[PDB]
Design a protein around this ligand. Structure first.
Ligand SMILES: *[C@@H]1O[C@H](CO)[C@@H](O[C@@H]2O[C@H](CO)[C@@H](O[C@@H]3O[C@H](CO)[C@@H](O)[C@H](O[C@H]4O[C@H](CO)[C@@H](O)[C@H](O)[C@@H]4O)[C@@H]3O)[C@H](O)[C@H]2NC(C)=O)[C@H](O)[C@H]1NC(C)=O
Ligand SMILES: *[C@@H]1O[C@H](CO)[C@@H](O[C@@H]2O[C@H](CO)[C@@H](O[C@@H]3O[C@H](CO)[C@@H](O)[C@H](O[C@H]4O[C@H](CO)[C@@H](O)[C@H](O)[C@@H]4O)[C@@H]3O)[C@H](O)[C@H]2NC(C)=O)[C@H](O)[C@H]1NC(C)=O
Ligand SMILES: *[C@@H]1O[C@H](CO)[C@@H](O[C@@H]2O[C@H](CO)[C@@H](O)[C@H](O)[C@H]2NC(C)=O)[C@H](O)[C@H]1NC(C)=O
Ligand SMILES: *[C@@H]1O[C@H](CO)[C@@H](O[C@@H]2O[C@H](CO)[C@@H](O)[C@H](O)[C@H]2NC(C)=O)[C@H](O)[C@H]1NC(C)=O
Ligand SMILES: *[C@@H]1O[C@H](CO)[C@@H](O[C@@H]2O[C@H](CO)[C@@H](O)[C@H](O)[C@H]2NC(C)=O)[C@H](O)[C@H]1NC(C)=O
Ligand SMILES: *[C@@H]1O[C@H](CO)[C@@H](O[C@@H]2O[C@H](CO)[C@@H](O)[C@H](O)[C@H]2NC(C)=O)[C@H](O)[C@H]1NC(C)=O
Ligand SMILES: *[C@@H]1O[C@H](CO)[C@@H](O[C@@H]2O[C@H](CO)[C@@H](O)[C@H](O)[C@H]2NC(C)=O)[C@H](O)[C@H]1NC(C)=O
Ligand SMILES: *[C@@H]1O[C@H](CO)[C@@H](O[C@@H]2O[C@H](CO)[C@@H](O)[C@H](O)[C@H]2NC(C)=O)[C@H](O)[C@H]1NC(C)=O
Ligand SMILES: *[C@@H]1O[C@H](CO)[C@@H](O[C@@H]2O[C@H](CO)[C@@H](O)[C@H](O)[C@H]2NC(C)=O)[C@H](O)[C@H]1NC(C)=O
Ligand SMILES: *[C@@H]1O[C@H](CO)[C@@H](O)[C@H](O)[C@H]1NC(C)=O
Ligand SMILES: *[C@@H]1O[C@H](CO)[C@@H](O)[C@H](O)[C@H]1NC(C)=O
Ligand SMILES: *[C@@H]1O[C@H](CO)[C@@H](O)[C@H](O)[C@H]1NC(C)=O
Ligand SMILES: *[C@@H]1O[C@H](CO)[C@@H](O)[C@H](O)[C@H]1NC(C)=O
Ligand SMILES: *[C@@H]1O[C@H](CO)[C@@H](O)[C@H](O)[C@H]1NC(C)=O
Ligand SMILES: *[C@@H]1O[C@H](CO)[C@@H](O)[C@H](O)[C@H]1NC(C)=O
Ligand SMILES: *[C@@H]1O[C@H](CO)[C@@H](O)[C@H](O)[C@H]1NC(C)=O
Ligand SMILES: *[C@@H]1O[C@H](CO)[C@@H](O)[C@H](O)[C@H]1NC(C)=O
Ligand SMILES: *[C@@H]1O[C@H](CO)[C@@H](O)[C@H](O)[C@H]1NC(C)=O
Ligand SMILES: *[C@@H]1O[C@H](CO)[C@@H](O)[C@H](O)[C@H]1NC(C)=O
Ligand SMILES: *[C@@H]1O[C@H](CO)[C@@H](O)[C@H](O)[C@H]1NC(C)=O
Ligand SMILES: *[C@@H]1O[C@H](CO)[C@@H](O)[C@H](O)[C@H]1NC(C)=O
Ligand SMILES: *[C@@H]1O[C@H](CO)[C@@H](O)[C@H](O)[C@H]1NC(C)=O
Ligand SMILES: *[C@@H]1O[C@H](CO)[C@@H](O)[C@H](O)[C@H]1NC(C)=O
Ligand SMILES: *[C@@H]1O[C@H](CO)[C@@H](O)[C@H](O)[C@H]1NC(C)=O
Ligand SMILES: *[C@@H]1O[C@H](CO)[C@@H](O)[C@H](O)[C@H]1NC(C)=O
Ligand SMILES: *[C@@H]1O[C@H](CO)[C@@H](O)[C@H](O)[C@H]1NC(C)=O
Ligand SMILES: *[C@@H]1O[C@H](CO)[C@@H](O)[C@H](O)[C@H]1NC(C)=O
Ligand SMILES: *[C@@H]1O[C@H](CO)[C@@H](O)[C@H](O)[C@H]1NC(C)=O
Ligand SMILES: *[C@@H]1O[C@H](CO)[C@@H](O)[C@H](O)[C@H]1NC(C)=O
Ligand SMILES: *[C@@H]1O[C@H](CO)[C@@H](O)[C@H](O)[C@H]1NC(C)=O
Ligand SMILES: *[C@@H]1O[C@H](CO)[C@@H](O)[C@H](O)[C@H]1NC(C)=O
Ligand SMILES: *[C@@H]1O[C@H](CO)[C@@H](O)[C@H](O)[C@H]1NC(C)=O
Ligand SMILES: *[C@@H]1O[C@H](CO)[C@@H](O)[C@H](O)[C@H]1NC(C)=O
Lengths: 432, 121, 121, 121, 432
């Protein structure tokens, strides 16, 4: 009566190590497995599987992998310890517009040279957000000097978010939920087995999610607990909103030798006029998009509820603004022009630029972003929002963010990792 | 037809014809260690199942007929329900609590016949 | 006599008496990773061949007689040429294009008898 | 009863009923390498013994009866002393010098019957 | 009819990772497997195998392994950053012969001390090839100061080229071609299987190949394409030519403390007379050897062709001279006295010595070779040449080199790595 089968199509929830695969990067370079040009996907008929995007450890793994890869790409680069000196700074007033009056500072300092016996007097431009006035009214220091060592990113390694595919090790499988109108939790039909995830771009941003995937039919609202005001709401658009960002300043770069085989990349004089960095969002598109978002929020809050949008709360620049990295430079844009309405050309968002960046939410590891020559222009898709609900007839929504896991959870919500358990027994009617 | 786990939603007797489909899918130094650990584990898991089939007398087989009777207390169902209505995922849940008992019995009956076969030679 | 690969230049029927000779030869952290990868790979390659023999019903054997007929289109030669004139290196080249067909057929015939053997019990 | 190596002080015929007890117990990057090497080695040692049982025709068994006669020069004792008085540790010392001879003979007799079995088919 | 065999003596070309084995080294120390005192070699009767030394990836692997081992042996050693200072230099004129007038410079400088508060005035001797005049006519800097950081090799690790055996992992095998008169490509009979290669010494040199293996019968000319003047010709001698090199200067060494637990090894005053380093090649032996080389070149170029030898073309010292490392010091010898003839006591080759070495062909990692006390004398075998053909009745051959892979290709030409494929099927006459 007892019979033993091996190769039985049974699985259990599991947590394992996934490996990266992909078709001068910060992240995946040669330490990444080449992908399968014709990957498989198998539809599972009559299979219902429970998914929970808020308990998905693929998110934790991706967070750890991208931070570790980030650090490994800075480890061999030039230390800028010799740069933490007293700076003598004045204002840049040459062909400066009103929007940036006081934003750039012209600083001179005594830097080391290839030879230990000699110093050189050099100057460079810094943004006001990179420096601290000390004491002598022209004396400044870089912002990180009392907190951390700073290194210069190697200007050969780009920050372009080249996609990574996560693949399961043998004995494991990745299940994908294809059920449209899947809100991140509970069971879903239409489950398929895949070898690897689709390519997910490690785009780093706050408030607005850029260059991600789109919802299949309608705008979707996902949250761990929609009635808990301490939780974030991830909003996935079913259409992109195009955003055009720029730094309209023709910059030049100069190399300062600071030691035997090391150089600092400094910003030289700006060619032409000096103007403020900004992003343009089409107003009509934004308005239609916001339309769809409210229609869906009402499904959870009432169709007779007043829904208001408001700008972010105060706090650190890295959280209160829309942070992104494009063209190799780090932008901090003011989104109060996008979130200012009751219910529901172009909208111009002014932006600030920084050179000294404290990544993720760490303290102790700062990096200096070498300046980029020429003029930067970026075109990207807003594919979703991170909102926080401020809270009896109205609700207020504000932009949120800063926890990078929310930016990956939004792409990995469809995937689950399971472990295959090939043995099983059953009654039959035979006897050895 | 469908490949790996394609039969997962099929009934137990519709499935169990695809056993080779699943059996074949079981097969900077920090990234090196992570990948090796994943590969070493796949090997170790594979070998534990093979050792277990071996001690039960099922080495080299995907379908092994044993000499242990089925206890109706493990699952009081007939063959029609088990093989024609249920899927393997459902079955695994139904008898989860009896798996270790069954495994112990399978080992014991093999030890007994392994010895009887020596006495007959 | 000669050891590993000593029979490589011998004919197929002169060779194939040395199967255990070849079967037994299949078994600063950066240098650590390189050596472990080589060792892990040797294990994985060994196990894939063993799994394959298993699903064909040839587990535990070096010479396995199967129940699949030879198609003359794969190689229209008699036994005298194959076993007395040819070497294994030459043979492997001659039928390279049919290897996957043959492997698929071997798996299928094992699945069929594995099931027939259950019905007879 | 007692678990792993519990029978070590028992006689050979009292032991050898516990074979599955022992068979189942065979299964910062610097610490990573040390642990992986230990795990890889456990796998390699396991597989070498399994390959060896395979070439002797004992695959899948814990007690394998062979077709090689015992030479009294290896140990001139009767069954009563070997199975009822001696332990396996004592026996291993007594015939240590003949282990490789016996292993060679076991391989040879398997090669001969493996071939005879082909001629009969 | 179908039968399955396992353990079939069949193989395919393959590329794998080989491991090192061997019987205070730069290269193989304890991270190397002890060798088998009685290694096996199995002759394969009736096996013809195609070899191609120019596509042999064992060469690429060896190149990578020796560079990586080299770097790992410098990683823990003293950094000489504090040495890149302005030097005040004069000439060494004390008992200096004419051949070296102006070759050594006596330089003083202000070096750091164990204590951060104090400096010390020290002096040392440098070769003119190690320094650059700057600006003040006595001011010099070390040559690497505007290019790279320099480290001091640890004077406990020798550079002696102790042999390495390459061994295949299980499932793979190394095939050796024993066919005498094998020119590196095409099929050859007389193939044997080996567990490992013979011991190959990682000798690093240009132009002349030292201490390698000899041809079995006659001098052999090997090339990828003998009619392509862009390719090198490797010439393997069937007899050694003995070469005796020396640095006839009784040097002394002094240790300068430069920090808390670090010291710089400087060259002190030379004891006795100062004379030029040189190498002696027996003339008659060289002439007979060259005789044999031409006789064989004529097989490819015509037996009525005029063959001329000429010295190297201009370019970097590391290429135009015969570079080698002996006794712990790096020599650059002038070979124009060896390659100066139409067709076909001792020949003295003058040599230069350097302390600052840029290994392989890299930029950014320089090393300082501590001086060796006493007098250096080396005896070695010239076992072959690297020639380049300069090119209608005559051909000119000149010394070449600098690409280290050509020095290993000359020892690994006999070996091929193959993968064993133990399964196979065949018709038989039996039925399960
Ligand atoms: C969202 O996706 C879009 C596209 O999918 C992405 O926009 C792309 O950004 C990159 C980087 O800014 C653009 O590529 C650059 O274009 C400029 C044009 O003058 C070139 O000069 C750049 O080349 C320099 O830098 C390279 C860095 O390795 C060097 O290798 C090179 O030699 C040059 O130095 C570079 O080509 C790209 O064109 C756009 N794509 C489009 C369609 O505009 C956008 O950034 C994504 N959004 C976010 C926030 O990531
Ligand atoms: C070609 O091969 C020959 C031999 O096969 C090789 O010549 C050998 O070179 C080494 C290194 O120069 C010689 O050994 C040295 O001899 C001197 C003699 O006074 C000793 O002082 C040296 O010992 C010191 O350095 C050691 C380094 O670890 C210390 O451990 C030791 O305590 C001393 O400090 C050392 O013994 C060797 O004798 C010659 N061999 C012969 C036969 O002359 C030659 O260099 C090879 N050619 C090339 C280019 O590699
Ligand atoms: C930043 O300050 C520097 C001086 O510290 C300015 O550079 C000088 O510009 C004058 C203009 O004629 C030149 O004559 C000087 O020779 C320049 N000095 C150097 C060191 O080059 C610089 O232009 C200022 N930059 C900005 C943007 O205001
Ligand atoms: C983001 O942009 C808005 C719009 O330009 C800034 O809003 C101004 O804030 C000051 C602060 O009291 C008000 O007095 C102005 O009237 C605001 N302007 C408008 C049009 O509302 C806002 O300050 C910017 N945020 C940050 C952090 O700089
Ligand atoms: C913004 O989103 C649109 C819509 O997804 C992207 O355009 C699509 O790109 C895919 C790529 O295969 C095409 O198949 C679609 O047909 C494109 N849609 C349209 C309407 O052309 C667009 O590339 C995205 N922009 C960025 C910067 O990623
Ligand atoms: C480092 O300094 C050396 C010495 O001044 C530079 O090499 C010289 O470059 C000039 C360029 O015209 C040549 O004419 C000289 O012959 C070179 N000298 C030598 C000794 O080769 C070298 O380029 C400098 N390196 C850098 C990165 O600037
Ligand atoms: C290199 O220069 C140093 C001085 O910078 C010479 O050393 C001096 O030699 C005189 C000779 O009597 C001594 O009195 C001094 O005390 C020495 N100075 C030091 C610091 O020891 C040195 O001999 C020169 N070396 C060569 C090879 O010319
Ligand atoms: C290599 O040695 C030869 C021989 O001593 C040097 O040859 C001399 O080169 C100069 C350059 O014009 C000629 O004027 C001499 O007549 C040459 N002498 C002989 C005997 O030919 C050669 O310069 C040395 N090479 C280098 C790079 O120093
Ligand atoms: C130079 O080459 C000769 C010839 O190969 C080497 O001497 C041989 O060394 C082997 C080592 O086992 C002996 O078996 C040979 O009999 C030796 N030949 C002669 C003629 O004695 C010599 O050692 C090489 N020199 C160097 C420095 O490697
Ligand atoms: C402002 O731009 C014009 C454009 O030609 C330039 O001539 C002028 O000098 C600039 N002013 C300053 C202060 O640089
Ligand atoms: C730079 O501009 C700011 C604008 O508020 C002003 O307060 C500051 O004093 C200016 N600095 C100098 C050096 O003139
Ligand atoms: C550089 O050092 C000199 C030394 O006198 C000092 O006067 C000068 O102000 C320093 N430069 C800066 C920008 O601090
Ligand atoms: C998501 O769908 C499940 C399906 O039952 C539902 O229970 C859950 O409440 C939904 N999420 C929200 C935020 O309503
Ligand atoms: C959602 O948040 C509310 C806020 O108090 C809490 O009471 C409720 O239990 C939460 N939902 C779940 C499923 O815990
Ligand atoms: C962005 O640039 C494209 C052309 O590259 C233009 O068509 C589009 O309207 C721009 N978007 C905005 C918001 O200006
Ligand atoms: C939000 O808008 C208000 C309008 O008064 C402004 O004061 C506030 O600073 C804005 N907050 C941010 C973070 O921009
Ligand atoms: C927000 O809406 C009010 C409505 O009167 C408008 O006056 C204000 O300028 C808007 N704020 C922004 C930042 O556009
Ligand atoms: C920046 O100025 C230089 C000066 O000639 C000009 O050639 C270059 O095109 C300018 N860059 C841009 C993006 O206009
Ligand atoms: C069947 O299981 C029950 C307990 O679940 C046990 O008491 C009974 O003896 C078992 N049947 C046999 C034949 O052992
Ligand atoms: C046997 O099969 C019949 C089919 O209807 C089912 O009703 C009955 O309950 C089954 N036996 C058991 C033990 O459940
Ligand atoms: C033999 O192979 C041919 C094609 O190569 C195929 O058509 C034929 O049916 C095969 N024979 C059998 C018995 O299947
Ligand atoms: C059978 O063997 C004979 C031996 O001469 C050979 O000539 C004949 O061609 C073989 N049969 C086939 C199918 O080739
Ligand atoms: C038994 O062993 C002896 C040597 O120990 C050997 O000579 C004898 O032939 C062996 N017996 C048989 C049957 O081979
Ligand atoms: C056989 O068993 C008896 C038991 O006393 C023992 O005395 C005798 O020596 C044994 N035979 C041999 C070969 O030792
Ligand atoms: C030259 O060598 C002799 C040898 O004794 C020595 O006395 C003399 O002082 C040396 N000359 C110099 C300048 O050192
Ligand atoms: C050193 O000798 C060289 C030889 O040419 C000469 O040019 C140089 O000026 C001398 N240096 C000193 C400091 O006398
Ligand atoms: C060492 O420093 C002193 C400081 O006055 C200077 O005069 C001397 O020339 C320096 N020494 C050298 C060799 O440069
Ligand atoms: C090397 O020998 C092969 C054997 O055929 C020949 O084809 C090849 O041309 C030879 N190499 C040269 C450079 O002639
Ligand atoms: C050898 O070099 C000549 C030079 O042009 C070229 O034509 C010839 O094809 C090369 N040989 C081979 C085999 O490619
Ligand atoms: C090298 O030295 C040996 C003695 O050690 C000597 O016999 C030989 O002739 C020398 N070679 C030359 C070229 O002088
Ligand atoms: C080669 O010999 C010529 C003879 O005039 C000489 O000029 C040239 O510099 C020599 N080349 C080298 C690299 O020694
Ligand atoms: C090269 O040969 C010529 C022949 O006259 C001779 O004069 C010259 O000195 C030789 N060159 C060298 C470097 O020996
Ligand atoms: C170097 O000089 C010292 C001074 O006594 C002497 O003892 C030593 O032997 C000399 N070295 C050589 C190699 O002659």
């Amino acid at each position: 009566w007892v019979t033993v089968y091996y190769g039985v199509p049974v699985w259990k929830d599991a947590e394992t190590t996934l490996f990266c695969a992909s078709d001068h990067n910060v992240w995946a370079t040669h330490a990444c497995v080449p992908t399968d040009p014709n990957p498989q996907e198998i539809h599972l008929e009559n299979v219902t599987e429970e998914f929970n995007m808020w308990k998905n450890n693929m998110v934790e793994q991706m967070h750890t992998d991208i931070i570790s890869l980030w650090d490994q790409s800075l480890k061999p680069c030039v230390k800028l310890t010799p740069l933490c000196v007293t700076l003598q700074c004045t204002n840049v007033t040459n062909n400066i517009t009103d929007d940036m009056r006081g934003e750039l500072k012209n600083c001179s300092f005594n830097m080391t040279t290839e030879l230990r016996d000699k110093k050189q007097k050099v100057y460079s431009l810094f943004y006001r957000l990179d420096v601290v006035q000390i004491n002598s009214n022209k004396e400044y220091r870089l912002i990180n000097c009392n907190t951390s060592a700073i290194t210069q990113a190697c200007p050969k390694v780009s920050f372009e978010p080249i996609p990574i595919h996560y693949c399961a090790p043998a004995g494991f499988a990745i299940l994908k939920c294809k059920d449209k109108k899947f809100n991140g939790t509970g069971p879903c039909p239409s489950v398929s087995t895949v070898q690897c995830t689709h390519g997910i771009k490690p785009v780093v941003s706050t408030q607005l999610l850029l260059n991600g995937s789109l919802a299949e039919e309608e705008v979707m609202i996902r949250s761990e607990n929609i009635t808990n005001n301490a939780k974030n709401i991830l909003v996935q658009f079913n259409t992109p909103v195009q955003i055009n960002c720029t730094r309209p300043n023709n910059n030049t770069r100069k190399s300062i030798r600071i030691g035997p085989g090391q150089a600092f990349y400094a910003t030289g004089d700006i060619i032409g006029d000096i103007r403020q960095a900004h992003c343009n969002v089409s107003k009509a598109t934004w308005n239609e998009t916001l339309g769809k978002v409210v229609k869906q929020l009402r499904k959870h809050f009432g169709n007779n509820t007043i829904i208001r949008f408001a700008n972010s709360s105060g706090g650190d620049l890295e959280v209160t603004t829309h942070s992104f990295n494009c063209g190799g430079e780090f932008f901090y844009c003011n989104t109060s022009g996008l979130f200012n309405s009751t219910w529901i050309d172009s909208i111009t968002l002014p932006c600030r630029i920084k050179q000294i960046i404290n990544m993720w939410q760490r303290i102790g590891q700062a990096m200096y972003a070498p300046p980029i020559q020429g003029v930067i222009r970026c075109v990207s898709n807003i594919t979703g929002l991170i909102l926080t609900r401020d809270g009896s007839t109205t609700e207020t929504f504000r932009p949120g963010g800063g926890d990078m896991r929310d930016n990956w959870r939004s792409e990995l919500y469809k995937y689950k990792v399971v472990k295959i358990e090939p043995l099983g027994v059953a009654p039959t009617r035979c006897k050895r | 037809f469908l490949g790996f786990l394609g039969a997962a939603g099929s009934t137990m007797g519709a499935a169990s014809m695809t056993l080779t489909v699943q059996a074949r899918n079981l097969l900077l130094t920090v990234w090196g260690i992570k990948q090796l650990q994943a590969r070493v584990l796949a090997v170790e898991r594979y070998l534990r199942d093979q050792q277990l089939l071996g001690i039960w007398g099922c080495s080299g087989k995907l379908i092994c007929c044993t000499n242990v009777p089925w206890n109706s207390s493990w699952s009081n169902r007939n063959l029609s329900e088990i093989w024609d209505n249920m899927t393997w995922l459902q079955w695994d849940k139904e008898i989860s609590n009896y798996t270790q008992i069954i495994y112990g019995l399978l080992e014991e009956s093999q030890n007994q016949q392994e010895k009887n076969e020596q006495d007959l030679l």
